[PDB]
């Protein structure tokens, strides 16, 4: 069941270690793919995962990311607004997303309106990137054609002003 589960998660786009899957594995030895997807999605990604992104993803000399990939948001900042205001309507909303895979970190820029990732999105929310996605000057480009927001729930973001 381990091999078929690993293949199913690979197809679905989740890259989780064997120990992470076993931790996400429920009491029965029988594991349902949707059930483990839900359980893992509820948990923080830094504990469970595997090395997906290249070690130099934050240096610019990659320029491409291929295949499905699940990533965890950690901090969202509105670049087009001052740090004091953070909600001014004097600029189109551009979001800088600090994404993690559990081992390294990458930074992504909105580059277009999403209507699915907002400044109220809690850290721990997970996003799936599908198809080829562009990297320029060490920044991921997040158009609406590849970012799918899976509704996450993690206990962070307790204090906000």
């Amino acid at each position: 069941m381990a091999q078929v589960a690993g293949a199913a998660l690979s197809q679905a786009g989740w890259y989780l270690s064997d120990e992470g899957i076993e931790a996400c594995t429920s009491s029965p030895d029988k594991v349902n793919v949707n059930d483990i997807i839900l359980i893992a999605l509820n948990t923080d990604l830094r504990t469970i995962g595997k090395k997906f992104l290249p070690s130099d993803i934050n240096s610019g000399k990659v320029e491409k990311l291929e295949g499905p990939c699940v990533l965890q948001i950690q901090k969202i900042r509105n670049v087009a607004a001052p740090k004091d205001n953070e909600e001014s309507q004097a600029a189109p909303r551009m979001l800088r997303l600090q994404m993690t895979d559990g081992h390294i970190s990458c930074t992504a820029v909105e580059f277009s309106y999403m209507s699915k990732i907002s400044l109220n999105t809690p850290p721990g929310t997970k996003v799936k990137l599908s198809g080829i996605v562009d990297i320029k000057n060490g920044f991921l480009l997040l158009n609406d054609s590849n970012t799918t927001v899976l509704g996450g729930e993690v206990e962070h973001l307790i204090e906000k002003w």
Partner: protein, 612 residues
Amino acid sequence: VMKTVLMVAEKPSLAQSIAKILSRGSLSSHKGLNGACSVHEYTGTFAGQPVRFKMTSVCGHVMTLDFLGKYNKWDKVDPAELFSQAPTEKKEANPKLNMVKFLQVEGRGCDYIVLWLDCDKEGENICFEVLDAVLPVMNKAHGGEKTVFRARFSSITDTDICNAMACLGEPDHNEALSVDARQELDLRIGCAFTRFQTKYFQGKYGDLDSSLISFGPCQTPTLGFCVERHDKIQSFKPETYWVLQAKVNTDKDRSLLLDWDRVRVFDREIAQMFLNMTKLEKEAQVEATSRKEKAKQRPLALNTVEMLRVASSSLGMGPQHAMQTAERLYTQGYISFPRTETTHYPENFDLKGSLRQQANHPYWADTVKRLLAEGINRPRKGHDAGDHPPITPMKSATEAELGGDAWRLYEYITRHFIATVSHDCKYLQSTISFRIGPELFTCSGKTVLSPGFTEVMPWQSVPLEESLPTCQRGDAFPVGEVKMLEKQTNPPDYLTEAELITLMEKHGIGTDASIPVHINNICQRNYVTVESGRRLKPTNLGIVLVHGYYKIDAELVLPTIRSAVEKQLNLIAQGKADYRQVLGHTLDVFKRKFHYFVDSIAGMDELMEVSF
């Protein structure tokens, strides 16, 4: 056989304007004992009998409210005693004008007294003072009858007859007590606080000797506005933001400058990326061109607040100076009443006549003549309030007969009136959207079509741009040097007088005639200083006062407390709430606050010890 009739108006101007209308020319010149009023006679019939009319004026507010002579001395009364243990009496304002005895000697006839005073709360106060003065001397009522009547009017041209016959009601003591309660509250709330502060700070700090520290329901929040802007200006950290600007060459050397669709980027690497996607690319396409007709809407009718704001901002005159100049102009008869909050014109207004009067001045002659020939647009509908008509010119004026600040204010008043009567501005807003890679830029321009009120206010004009090229989409304009500009956020500057007046009006602090007085008071008490473009920079005294107030029961400075007290006064006036109960409740609440303040003053003391 003839029965005497008495009538009282507020100023002898209204006395003339009412007698000449209600008497059909039969008047008299009977200058009174005081030497400042007039008595007018007439013959009529209000209750089916020949009655000899009599009509006079009580100029200004008759009696003021002040403490007894024992408690006015600063060194003999404990300030707290001013809250509840201090009697208060109604003295006669400007006693050299013996108004009370004038009224008493003129009042000898019964069966008729009416009240042609202002139709506001001030008018109710004045009228009940007049009735108090006049009843003890008038003739006794014979059996059951009504002797006291009141007339209500918003104009004195032809409504006066209908008011004289039908609209003969009674005065409203409930609303006439609201102003008395306000006076008593304000006097007791001040006086005591300022006396305590003055006797405390004049015996502890040398540099404050022979200086007055004043607290009031309107002065202190006014200072607090400037102090909070000072807190914001000294509690701001500049932030660096990068704006990407690129230019294109349209035909030969037009050098069209564009601005980025995303107006700013508060990051360095992101801005460098967005430059790297645009720098090395040499062409630029166009995606959308939009030509839209838009209208810059005409100004409303002038009121005192907007007049003061414009005098402070554009003309360069203080609020008290502007108010004094307006009062002087009204006294000479050039303009109308200058303290009015009515941005709406009355239905029966001679707009054509007022505009035709200003048809022989070499600054507005052509515009006024063309406007009268073509037609006049109806003025914008505004917020009427019933307190006198808006400020409008009433007589032709020229540089020779008045000069300086008087002319500089008259010019603005006349131009505002003409602009209100004139047409509306129209301009083409042409926006062109360029694409210089995976990046969008835009360029906007304005082109006037029919200058309306712009022709009479050449400071609301649309700036002259050099037009935009007619692009048909799919162009291939060459680009220039796409540069990443580095900029810093600018800290806010100190409050201007116009902004302070706007805050006063928004929060209800002060009235149409007390805003300049409050601003001048905070300026002369060495709390704020006027600097550059009429900016009110707070001084050390203002900073320490407002900060200490924030530390010590911080609700004596917030603008909301004055609004709450005013709501209580309105509840008094309408009738829902009583008078003595609310008087005592507010007095005791603020007495508790003052007792807290007196023993908590150590915070303000230690906050002042850092300064002088």
